[PDB]
């Protein structure tokens, strides 16, 4: 409807991912992962094979995949520490250290 | 002390740091930091992982039976999508 | 258990200093009990069933 009425193109990732703000939490992390892997400052070329073959864009896919896996393990280290605070002895200082 | 060096020096691609990497994410994260894109001919090939070698390694040199796809489908989707094999990840996710 | 410490971090200290043979079932029963009393505080159902 937004294309037909000429409007600004919406982010289709946020339209689809809000269907994963419902029940299945694994589909919710799957859409979070898809979104972090489409967070890419693409070269606006008329060729997908040249953009997917770029050295810069393939560095960006790995830079995002590492950021996703790092925030994933940051969520795991947060949840593990907040469940076990009496062992963990977190105190009162914020930061990953 | 091994794992931190194998990351920072992009070396020992044939070690998996399995005393430190608990899970499939940690294999992905180890090997993804070990990636090069660049033909620096001073790198010996026994230390040289490209993204395209790692893409093939997951899709063809391990495959759908290695990741137990029928029981953990989102983990194999994670393995393909975090290696930017988006078309293979869709042609997997459009089966089940 | 009350103050929500893990009993592995006292059973394995008792086992060097109590019956010097196979001090075992005191620790198994204590851990079975720790898991049962932690199940009284766990609100995620599938993990209480775990």
């Amino acid at each position: 409807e937004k294309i037909v009425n000429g409007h600004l193109q919406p982010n289709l990732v946020d339209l689809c991912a809000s269907v994963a703000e419902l029940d299945d939490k694994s589909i919710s992390d799957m859409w979070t992962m898809v979104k972090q892997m489409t967070d890419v400052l693409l070269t606006p070329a008329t060729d997908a094979l040249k953009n997917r073959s770029s050295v810069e864009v393939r560095m960006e896919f790995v830079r995002q995949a590492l950021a996703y896996l790092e925030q994933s393990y940051k969520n795991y280290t947060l949840v593990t520490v907040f469940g076990n605070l009496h062992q963990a002895q977190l105190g009162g200082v914020p930061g990953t250290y | 002390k091994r794992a931190v060096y194998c990351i920072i020096g992009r070396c020992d691609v044939t070690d998996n740091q399995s005393e430190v990497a608990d899970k499939t994410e940690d294999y992905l994260w180890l090997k993804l930091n070990q990636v090069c894109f660049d033909d620096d001919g001073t790198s010996s090939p026994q230390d040289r992982l490209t993204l395209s070698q790692f893409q093939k390694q997951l899709l063809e040199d391990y495959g759908e039976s290695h990741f137990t796809v029928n029981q953990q489908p989102f983990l194999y989707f994670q393995v393909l999508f975090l290696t930017a094999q988006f078309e293979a990840a869709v042609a997997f996710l459009f089966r089940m | 258990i009350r103050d929500n410490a893990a009993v592995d971090g006292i059973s394995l200290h008792l086992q060097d200093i109590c019956p010097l043979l196979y001090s075992t079932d005191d620790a198994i029963c204590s851990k079975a009990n720790e898991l049962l009393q932690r199940s009284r505080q766990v609100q995620n159902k599938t993990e209480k069933e775990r």
């Binding site: 029940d23 939490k25 919710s28 992390d29 994933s72 393990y73 969520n75 795991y76 949840v79 593990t80 | 044939t14 998996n16 399995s18 990497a21 608990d22 899970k23 499939t24 994410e25 940690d26 294999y27 992905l28 997951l58 391990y62 290695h66 990741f67 137990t68 953990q72 989102f74 983990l75 994670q78 393995v79 | 995620n44 599938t46 993990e47 775990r50």
Partner: peptide
């Protein structure tokens, strides 16, 4: 010898994330 493990970061967590809650 060289192979991936076959586990996610959430298996030894059993109940993860922000979801699986019946009301806000």
């Amino acid at each position: 010898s060289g192979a991936p493990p076959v586990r996610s970061i959430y298996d030894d967590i059993s109940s993860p994330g922000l979801g699986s809650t019946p009301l806000t």
